[PDB]
């Protein structure tokens, strides 16, 4: 299928409390594999996946050197924006970026990302033509115009076609085994008593990976789209994820309902029932 | 490998 290499960058200014906080975090197909945090002592580029340790000591010196440069870059960016928006030098603000690429299974460059956001809102991003930019507000037009002057798009296009695509291939070569791991969910239903003649049936899905999953309750052939309570998938904190869907039902009539768990790691969708 | 970032 498709794969991608993306970087989530953050630069948050803290008034008086010292210089700004800077971070870079890499993801290969949605999995963190590297991280540079300007706070931990000896701010360096650390691998975040055992498979990244096969990188020479030279890979990390260089990435660290580059990160420290990018960092100086964002201290400037922070000050600059304080200017465009006319915001006192006292506040605490945030710049975030998502830079990377997504290439299909045919090796073709599906998508190249270069998005900036200021204080939680879109600021400026590169269009799908990898040729033009989209400004989010009046401020971002200043940036847009500067970047069109300098030919920043040609710079990014060069990166996307060389470095991005090329190292995504390498990271994938070293990560294959680990990245394609798939833990099927273990599911069960719990019985809880609601006020009067009613009960809550809860379907639990545990220890699965990747996070993508779908749980549905069934009242004889139909799906309870309406009255179904269900939590946002959450991490167990050990590599896997959890989730549950619960439905309120008439006491004694619990057998009329069935839970269904659809996961990519399952040979076939699971069918669940409240077991006394 | 992360790209190098210019200025806003």
């Amino acid at each position, epitope marked *: 299928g498709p794969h991608s290499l993306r970087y989530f960058v953050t630069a948050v200014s803290r008034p008086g409390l010292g210089e700004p906080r800077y971070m870079e975090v890499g993801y290969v197909d949605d999995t963190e594999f590297v991280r540079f945090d300007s706070d931990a002592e000896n701010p360096r580029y650390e691998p975040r996946a055992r498979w990244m340790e096969q990188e020479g000591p030279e890979y990390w010196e260089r*990435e660290t050197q*580059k990160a420290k*440069g990018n960092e100086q870059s964002f*201290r400037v960016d922070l000050r600059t924006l304080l200017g465009y928006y006319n915001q006192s030098k006292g506040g605490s603000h945030t710049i975030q970026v998502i830079s990377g690429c997504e290439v299909g299974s045919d090796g073709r460059l599906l998508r190249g990302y270069q998005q900036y956001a200021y204080d939680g809102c879109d600021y400026i991003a590169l269009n799908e033509d990898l040729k033009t930019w989209t400004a989010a507000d009046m401020a971002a037009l200043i940036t847009k115009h500067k970047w069109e002057q*300098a030919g920043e798009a*040609e*710079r990014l296009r060069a990166y996307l076609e*060389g*470095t991005c695509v090329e190292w995504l291939r390498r990271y994938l070569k070293n990560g294959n085994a680990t990245l394609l791991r798939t833990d099927s969910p273990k599911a069960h239903v719990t019985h809880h008593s609601r006020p009067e003649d009613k009960v809550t049936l809860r379907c639990w899905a545990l220890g699965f990976y990747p996070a993508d999953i779908t749980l549905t309750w069934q009242l004889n052939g139909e799906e309870l789209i309406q009255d179904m309570e269900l939590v946002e998938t959450r991490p167990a904190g050990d590599g896997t994820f959890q989730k549950w869907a619960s439905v309120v039902v008439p006491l004694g009539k619990e057998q009329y309902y069935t839970c269904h768990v659809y996961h990519q790691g399952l040979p076939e969708p699971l069918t669940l029932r409240w077991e006394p | 490998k992360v790209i190098t970032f210019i*200025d806003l």
Partner: T-cell receptor
Amino acid sequence: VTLLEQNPRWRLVPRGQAVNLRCILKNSQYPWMSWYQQDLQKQLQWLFTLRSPGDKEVKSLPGADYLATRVTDTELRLQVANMSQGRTLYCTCSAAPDWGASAETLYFGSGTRLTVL
Amino acid sequence: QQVRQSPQSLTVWEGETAILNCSYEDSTFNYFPWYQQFPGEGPALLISIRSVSDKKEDGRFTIFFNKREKKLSLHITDSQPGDSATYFCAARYQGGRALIFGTGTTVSVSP
């Protein structure tokens, strides 16, 4: 051409004294400023790349000792002391460390030629 | 030591094809620009190539890139009185601060 303004173009140096070169950045879209030297046998070599004010770095080489400092967002300084032999110095600017100014590659001016005594 | 070209000197009859070699040791180098220096002023870009390509043609110049062997070459096909100058072969890696230059190759095209 004309992103930087480097002076003088040619210069003489009393072998006991040090020299102070200065580079003035014209367009600010290319913050990254560097120093390259071409020695008498024609070998070009990067010396420094500074980005922000307050930055100072000393690097010593066969023929000269160096001290580069980024004084402001437009002024990059280089003082060359103990200059035993001749070398010609070039100042450059770029968008990012691994890119040119508005172009993919670094651009060199006429530089400043330094002939001893 | 990172980049090194050869031969350091070369002469060729006008209308003839001069050929300059170059080689490097950092397999991470992704950009290779060739600069043309005429006695008197700074190095000026002549022709460049990206590691993702293996051939770059512009006018009478041609870069041959062999990513496998870490070797490139410039072909000044149909030389000329003027093409005479010193030719540097440079290289760099993504995120790198410096541009590494080869030791140069002086070329003289005598009519």
